Design a protein around this ligand. Structure first.
Ligand SMILES: CC(C)C[C@H](NC(=O)[C@@H](O)[C@H](N)Cc1ccccc1)C(=O)O
Ligand SMILES: CC(C)C[C@H](NC(=O)[C@@H](O)[C@H](N)Cc1ccccc1)C(=O)O
Ligand SMILES: [Zn+2]
Ligand SMILES: [Zn+2]
Lengths: 606, 605
């Protein structure tokens, strides 16, 4: 039983969904007629509990009659439970069809409605979804737990001048005989997926082929720079297939969303959603594609049972991503991204607290808001464990054999940390003595930094550690020693690392960040990862000059990784506090509901 | 798609089955309440066509409605179709639940109902099923085509001491309400399987653990020798996993059937069905386990689209089985089983005809009875192609990489030979130049022997070909030269090969088969593969003394590989013809329906 869901996967399972979605831009609504194939797992089951959040349920019908439904008490973040009385108690594992007519709220946490004024084309509105982790319940009533994987078919009614796309293969266009002003797009998803992987985009979209199974989709204005930035998608997909095995999803498309998309990348099956903030014109932030590609195996094919087991998803994907980086830029770069991961984990454990139970690899999420619980811990502590196991068991070639068999063993299924450990011991049966050496309790259920640190190559990192130390130990007299030469021989990833280590230490004087701008000219760097860290460093320093720059980056884009900390730091900055609160209220209606709720709680607004 | 089915896989797909099976031994029938989850593949579906054979359909209910159903024009072997005309036109990608109440006929081709006198001693009755290829129709209404793969859950009502087992994981024991002369044994199969892979056994069964995921099931009397004969099941399962990848079915159990089981092995998921005829007490015929284990990948996990594509299932499984035997007994033994395979193919081509289109690797089965079309061609011409490709593309290590990616590529799906050839060319993109050199037309759609013969190691075979040649070229004066020395140091597989050689050669004189008995004493060999060939050779020779021995083996065991040729040869033997016809008329009621029917074609009737 998932603590983030109201549904019981041990009682029943959704095996298939037929979705009739009516998209209305005037109402900002999605009226859904969902037909759910329910399989009973318990004998003589009388009730059916599904997850809903700000959803209006019109009617429920089980085998054509009308079933008695009842909504429970609305939880603080989990939403409202919906109970359905079945006409007959069934005989497990018996299957039945439950038809539900619902409608979303315009405030739906999963969706973002943009007027033409907000969009790039300025003629048409835009809609896009973000269901991960628990927002699918804000669109349709479901077992919104990654433990339940289902196949789906959908029909989407939209204004005829607009394009619609889903996390499925396109299955043709249909004419809406009732409304001539409308078109019906159809989609097929024959591979079982969890609810968080359901996605929908409706807008003025244009797409062009960039590979035998890759079309890049976005608004005309962003199309030309998106094809250059993500030209090597097929190469990345092929490199991943060599490592993980065959691609079972048929198609790998990309969609570049408006700047309000709350993440950098989203692995929606058949259609990866990407932020325009990675468009740096040099493909330095394009590892986001190799990461999303790798989810096609670790996450989408083999899913985490609950969000407590989220590291199985992100830790293995980060491992696969860094192996693709290995065959690309070299083993020295792979080792550097591994070491940079440790620092991001160190950066996340301090933000949450070295003692916070949320920093456990397998955390307790009972009565915990998953969106407010998001961190680099499942990513980097999860990766560190797999990279430490790799060194312990004989190298990358030997560890890849395990990962391949693991993907094959649990393909199309959901997995717990216990199943993963049982499989790890089953595979390394002759090396079981080396497995019994690892401190499993320290790795799985202990807050803070991991018990043991893996052996890393320090070739690329040495220059980053040195520069950072020089800056934190510099006085006003040493400021003159710093020059352009310090960052001139460094790559973008090397510049990210030195800034990250400066952010991890005590706040720098106003004179030092002024000296940084003087010799490094970090104010004109377009690279999002560098700029965000540079602005955050200046705010903590107490530099008043950076307030209009930090406010600019926090409002011109809506990626939570960047927007949420910039707003928090700006609020804790006394001189800026007034303007930042007033900047947020003036932009509150034009931002994503998840980003908004999280930024409003931080500012003590709500 | 399948010319053997009346169902349309392009129109709708069965995704799940909930089976409520009532088994009654007094009536010898299975009353089934099947709940089918139907997924529409067409935009506006009005009708639902399913396969049935000697089935009685009581009522059909679609989401709680008294649905109207009609049967079309009856077929000679495919069966009479069942049309369910839907009240409302289903849409593309929509799922519905179709409840059907049926009952089998006691003559059901899929089942065998053997009396308390036919079982071990005189304790309790026994029931066992055999679905492959098209007999699942004879139990439940379904899309009886391997192109449709579905998950299932079943509840079966059986007597207390008569334990029930299915091709699924056990999901606990339970009790019944009315008509209390039964007990519920429930099962769950969460891996999609084709209709030919559903299985059921009900009898006085006992089990014993021989491995973490293996328990041998048999009658107490056959239990002790079954655990010795199949002690190395886990070792074989592990050796297979090293070759094919992870075992996804959770458990691998074995069940040893009464001698009436029509085959040697049946790969039913989680519960392999094995003949008691392989119990030779030396594990010399235990490669049958390595073969059914291999089907867990090529067959169960990756299924043949139709029975025209049956070589993808049996050819790849024969290849995997011989890779396991090569690891247990060495590369020399592997090469010898391959060479012995070529000899088994030439025996089938000899029987069906060198020109018979049924001897094509991918045959046309339009208006063809699949049970009457069974041969070693999909097995051996299939294996030979894969073994010839192996030698052409760089060895076993390189060819195994292909097989591994092939299994992963098509896991949980059905495959055509066109998909297989497209995958072979994508995998060996580097060797398309050597691939375009193979005679694909000669290999896929030409009757008789394959176009090219693979290179074999002759170390173990040399002694077999020599002895056979000596026997066919011996005169009355040479008979004295033969001694025990000729066979006594040959292995059982070496003795099988020399007999197989002799059976393809011209009928031997009565004096020669009499001398064989004198120096080799082949009349007291218990090994089934040796005995069957020895008896067939003697019938071929016209030796009257072997008539009561051939009749004995043909009636004490019902494995079609042995029983069917022994009966055919005995009928074509003028002196025996009368007694053999009268011997089957006295055993007619005690045989399997698939075995008992094929005598109307062989013994003429
Ligand atoms: C590793 C990075 C390059 C990409 C990273 N994205 C991810 O890890 C995604 O695939 C995750 N799906 C992001 C996510 C996590 C939890 C809830 C909602 C969304 C991001 O920063 O957006
Ligand atoms: C090849 C041998 C090791 C065993 C052989 N059995 C098989 O090949 C099984 O896998 C077959 N699946 C048996 C079969 C074939 C066709 C129709 C119904 C049943 C047999 O002779 O019974
Ligand atoms: Zn990710
Ligand atoms: Zn077989």
């Amino acid at each position: 039983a998932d603590p983030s869901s109201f549904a019981s996967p041990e009682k029943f399972n959704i095996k298939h969904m037929h979705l009739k979605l009516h998209v209305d831009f005037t109402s900002r609504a999605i009226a859904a007629s969902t037909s759910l194939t329910v399989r009973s797992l318990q004998d003589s089951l009388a009730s059916l509990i599904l997850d809903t959040k700000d959803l209006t349920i019109k009617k429920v019908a089980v085998n054509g009659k009308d079933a008695t439904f009842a909504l429970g008490t609305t939880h603080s973040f989990k939403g409202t439970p919906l109970e359905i009385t079945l006409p007959f108690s069934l005989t497990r594992g018996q299957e039945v069809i439950v038809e539900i007519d619902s409608v979303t709220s315009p405030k739906s946490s999963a969706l973002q409605w943009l007027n033409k004024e907000q969009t790039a084309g300025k003629i048409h509105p835009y809609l896009f979804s973000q269901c991960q982790a628990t927002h699918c319940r804000s669109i349709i009533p479901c077992q919104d737990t990654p433990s339940v994987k289902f196949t789906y078919y959908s029909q989407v009614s939209v204004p005829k001048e607009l394009m619609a796309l889903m996390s499925a293969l396109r299955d043709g266009e249909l004419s809406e005989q009732s409304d001539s002003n409308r078109k019906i797009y159809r989609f097929k998803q024959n591979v079982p997926i969890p609810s968080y992987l359901i996605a929908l985009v409706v807008g003025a979209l244009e797409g062009r082929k960039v590979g035998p199974r890759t079309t890049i989709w976005t608004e005309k204005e962003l199309l030309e720079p998106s094809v250059y930035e993500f030209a090597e998608t097929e190469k990345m997909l092929k490199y991943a297939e060599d490592l993980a095995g065959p691609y079972v999803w048929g198609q790998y498309d990309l969609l570049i969303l408006p700047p309000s998309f709350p993440y950098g990348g989203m692995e929606n099956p058949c259609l990866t959603f990407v932020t325009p903030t990675v468009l740096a014109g040099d493909r330095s932030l394009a590892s986001v594609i190799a990461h999303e590609i790798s989810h096609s195996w670790t996450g989408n094919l083999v899913t985490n049972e609950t969000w407590e087991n989220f590291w199985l998803n992100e830790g293995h994907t980060v491992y696969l991503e860094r192996r693709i980086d290995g065959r690309l830029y070299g083993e020295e770069f792979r080792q550097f991204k591994a070491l940079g991961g440790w620092k991001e984990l160190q950066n996340s454990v301090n933000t949450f607290g070295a003692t916070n139970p949320l920093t456990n690899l397998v955390p307790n999420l009972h009565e915990v808001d998953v969106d407010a619980a998001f961190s680099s811990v499942p990513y980097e502590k999860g990766f560190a464990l797999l990279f430490y196991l790799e060194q312990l068991l004989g190298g990358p070639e030997i560890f890849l054999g395990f990962l391949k068999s693991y993907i094959q063993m649990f393909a199309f299924k959901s997995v717990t940390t216990e199943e993963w450990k049982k499989f790890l011991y089953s595979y390394f049966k002759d090396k079981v003595d080396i497995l019994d050496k690892v401190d499993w309790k320290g790795w799985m259920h202990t807050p803070g930094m991991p018990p043991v640190q893996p052996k890393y190559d320090m070739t690329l990192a040495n220059a980053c550690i040195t520069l950072g130390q020089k800056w934190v130990k510099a006085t006003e007299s040493d400021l003159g020693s710093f020059s352009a030469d310090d960052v001139k021989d460094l790559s973008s990833h090397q510049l990210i690392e030195v800034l990250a280590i400066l952010l991890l230490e005590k706040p720098l004087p106003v004179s030092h960040v002024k000296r940084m701008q003087e010799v490094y000219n970090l104010n004109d760097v377009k690279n999002s990862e560098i700029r965000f860290r540079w602005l955050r460093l200046c705010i903590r320093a107490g530099w008043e000059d950076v307030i209009p720059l930090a406010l600019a980056m926090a409002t011109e884009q809506g990626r939570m990784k960047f927007t949420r900390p910039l707003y928090r730091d700006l609020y804790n900055f006394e001189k800026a506090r007034e303007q930042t609160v007033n900047t947020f209220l003036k932009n509150r209606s034009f931002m994503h509901p998840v980003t908004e709720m999280l930024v409003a709680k931080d500012l003590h607004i709500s």
